[PDB]
Write a protein that binds this DNA or RNA. Structure first.
Ligand SMILES: [K+]
Ligand SMILES: [K+]
Ligand SMILES: [K+]
Ligand SMILES: [Mg+2]
Ligand SMILES: [Mg+2]
Ligand SMILES: [Mg+2]
Ligand SMILES: [Mg+2]
Ligand SMILES: [Mg+2]
Ligand SMILES: [Mg+2]
Ligand SMILES: [Mg+2]
Ligand SMILES: [Mg+2]
Ligand SMILES: [Mg+2]
Ligand SMILES: [Mg+2]
Ligand SMILES: [Mg+2]
Ligand SMILES: [Mg+2]
Ligand SMILES: [Mg+2]
Ligand SMILES: [Mg+2]
Lengths: 77, 92, 272, 52, 48
RNA sequence: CUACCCUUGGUCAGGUUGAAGCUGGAGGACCGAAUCGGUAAGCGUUGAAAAGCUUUCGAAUGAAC
RNA sequence: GAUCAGGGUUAGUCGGGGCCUAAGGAUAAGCCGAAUGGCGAUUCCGAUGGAAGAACCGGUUAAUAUUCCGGUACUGAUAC
RNA sequence: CCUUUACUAUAGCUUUACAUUGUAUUGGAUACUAACUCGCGGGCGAGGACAGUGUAUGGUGGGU
């Protein structure tokens, strides 16, 4: 599943619009990558599939709170 | 309900007239040879020495009405039983 | 090293085949062969992705040791065999401890010689040494790209490369294509050239030999219809315009190397 | 990215202090090694103590 | 001359039989349409 | 069905010629049945047949069937 | 070779199947992907192939016959 | 349905910017390793803030 595990972000459907206003279907994809993280509280490593927006949340409230927030809303499963 | 009925036909009467220990029954199509030897011996109280079997599908009986109303008779299995040499069976 | 046939039949008039004179054995080793399945150029979805492939003789695959990891253990050359899977010949080796392997047969390596691999091995034909321990100016084949991976370059019949210079952690090697590039000094190479150098003098002679080798006939684009090929169409023979493929790829000079490949840091001079 | 230095660090230093770095420097070098810890309110209160 | 229908019972069941229909979503969609119509013959597995 | 491919099986009367290495027995070699085709003519055209029949013809150890 | 009724196909060894694997197919751990799903082993399935378990001649019926009968063989289990 | 220097689009390829993405010396280079990438065997190598990818953008684009 191509879903961010911290934010839940997935691809959205839109249009290409030309100068003559021809509209053709397109996909807006997520800036999604796999990254390894050191988890200070648990003294371990985890690998997450997150967006660049999810990394911003990790680098603001910390890893541990981000995973707790992600598990409440149902993003990590 | 292994044995359905004995066979009284021209061929089988001649077979018995030559081999006095040779008889033939109709049995349930899914009974195996070991079971059939048990049934003929637990009902006629004899010593069965050999059993041969053959499977008959039923004859199709296609009638016509407004056409082709298919029909069929039930399938059966034939068992030719050989008794211990010197033993007989009486269907009366 | 070749045998030219007399023109008894029009199919044999221009046929030239190898003499098969270096071969010493007729059948392969049992523990080193396995039956090989044919693709007709079809991929795992069943669609034909490569044209002109199909048919040919049944072949068994031979396990060729391209890594030469048994370092320090001597080996002896037992037989030189035919191999349908490659243009060169192959040599069977019996190690002193009981192992057996096939290697590409270097030119000048013959039955009864002794071969070795490792950093403390003599630089002799058929020996595998790191480039760091190979003298400058030597003729070498079976060149590793990465250490521990295995020979990848300079393996076809008659091919060779020359080690020209040392640069510390890298050596400089000139390839069969004329390219000059830097290779890591911990990689491995085998001394000598690849044998069967007269393989490029053969002539098949007739269309049938191509089918034995597994190739199917190849059609020109100018003799098709426009729906099949951009070069098709026309009333009578036409040139078809600029040479291009079915997808419209220019066939007369367009460069296809990715212009930001990282290995360009190691390519000193280019010819390909 | 605000972090709490748990150790004395080259250039930026003076352990047990509030310092701001680029997100790459903190997430990838200081925290995985263990010369810093992310600065949240729930950790900055544990640092409001000095008791020296 | 050779005509289009050359029967093979093994090929018939592999291509159209009951177990091949049930193996895909679109095959089960076919079985649901034939049941809703009330067909007496569901697949080629019935005529046998 | 047909086009191509993959795996696994089968089939090819008889005669002739005489390469590499007096011998030897090669070949998308020769003649010719089975077989695979479909050159020419005749016939058929509410046909026996929604493409056939008769005679004739090509290949017939191979890119064969 | 039509309609109706009755009758007729007999195996330790034959042909299958039980065992094995090919092309290919379905999968496991994993990978990919709006959904439906697509891939993916040395795993399993799958003969047109391989099996170290073994039978041939004759005669009899209106209709079966290495199957029934005669003669002469062979191959597994099992008990003493 | 087919063609092209008809029109308008578009898959693909390619350019730059932001994100992924950091640190030193002297902006722009040089240098480093910890992000990230590949190989070996069951950590050691080789690269490296490039590459690849997302978004935006110019060019090309009868392949469609
Ligand atoms: K051609
Ligand atoms: K075209
Ligand atoms: K034809
Ligand atoms: Mg018997
Ligand atoms: Mg039977
Ligand atoms: Mg034409
Ligand atoms: Mg002209
Ligand atoms: Mg010929
Ligand atoms: Mg003929
Ligand atoms: Mg001729
Ligand atoms: Mg002929
Ligand atoms: Mg009658
Ligand atoms: Mg048998
Ligand atoms: Mg199996
Ligand atoms: Mg008869
Ligand atoms: Mg007999
Ligand atoms: Mg157009």
């Amino acid at each position: 599943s191509k879903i961010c595990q911290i934010t839940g972000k997935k691809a959205m459907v839109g249009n290409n619009v030309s100068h003559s206003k021809r509209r053709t279907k397109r996909v807006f994809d997520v800036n999604l990558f796999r990254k390894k993280f050191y988890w200070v509280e648990q003294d371990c490593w985890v690998v997450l599939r997150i967006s660049a927006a999810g990394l911003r949340l990790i680098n603001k409230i910390g890893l541990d709170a981000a995973i707790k927030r992600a598990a409440e809303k149902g993003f990590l499963n | 309900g292994i044995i359905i009925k004995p066979i009284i036909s021209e061929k089988m009467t001649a077979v018995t007239e030559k081999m006095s220990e040779r008889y033939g029954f109709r049995v349930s199509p899914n009974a195996n040879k070991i079971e059939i030897k048990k049934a003929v011996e637990a009902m006629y109280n004899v010593k069965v020495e050999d059993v041969n079997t053959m499977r008959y599908d039923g004859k199709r009986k296609n009638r016509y009405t407004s056409g082709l109303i298919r029909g069929k008779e039930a399938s059966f299995k034939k068992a030719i039983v050989t008794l211990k040499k010197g033993e007989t069976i009486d269907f009366f | 090293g070749i045998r030219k046939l007399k023109p008894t039949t029009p199919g044999q008039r221009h046929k030239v085949i190898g003499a098969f004179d270096k071969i010493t054995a007729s059948t392969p080793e049992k523990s080193l062969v396995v039956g090989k399945k044919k693709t007709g150029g079809r991929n795992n979805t069943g669609k034909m992705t490569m044209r002109y492939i199909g048919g040919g003789h049944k072949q068994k695959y031979r396990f060729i040791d391209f890594k030469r990891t048994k370092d320090g253990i001597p080996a002896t050359v037992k037989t030189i065999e035919y191999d349908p899977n490659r243009s060169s010949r192959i040599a069977l080796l019996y190690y002193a401890d009981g192992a057996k392997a096939y290697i590409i047969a270097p030119d000048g390596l013959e039955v009864g010689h002794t071969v070795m691999s490792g950093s403390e091995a003599a630089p002799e034909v058929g020996n595998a040494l790191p480039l760091a321990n190979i003298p400058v100016g030597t003729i070498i084949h079976n060149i590793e790209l990465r250490p521990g991976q295995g020979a990848k370059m300079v393996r076809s019949a008659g091919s060779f490369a020359q080690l020209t210079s040392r640069e510390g952690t890298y050596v400089v090697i000139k390839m069969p294509s004329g390219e000059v590039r830097r290779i890591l000094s911990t990689c491995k190479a085998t001394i000598g050239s690849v044998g069967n150098s007269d393989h490029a003098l053969e002539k098949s002679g007739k269309a049938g030999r191509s089918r034995w080798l597994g190739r199917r006939p190849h059609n020109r684009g100018v003799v098709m219809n426009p729906v099949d090929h951009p070069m098709g169409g026309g009333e009578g023979r036409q040139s078809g315009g600029h040479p291009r493929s079915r997808k419209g790829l220019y066939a007369k000079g367009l460069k296809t190397r990715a212009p930001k490949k990282h290995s360009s840091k190691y390519i000193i001079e280019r010819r390909k | 990215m605000q972090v709490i230095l748990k150790e004395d660090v080259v250039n930026l230093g003076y352990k047990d202090d509030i310092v701001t770095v680029k997100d790459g420097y903190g997430r990838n070098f200081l925290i995985p090694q263990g010369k810093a810890v992310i600065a949240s309110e729930s950790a900055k209160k544990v640092l409001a103590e000095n008791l020296r | 001359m050779k005509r289009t229908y050359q029967p093979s019972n093994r090929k018939r069941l592999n291509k159209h039989g009951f177990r091949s229909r049930m193996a895909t979503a679109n095959g089960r969609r076919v079985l649901a349409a034939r049941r809703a119509k009330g067909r007496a013959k569901l697949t080629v597995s019935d005529e046998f």
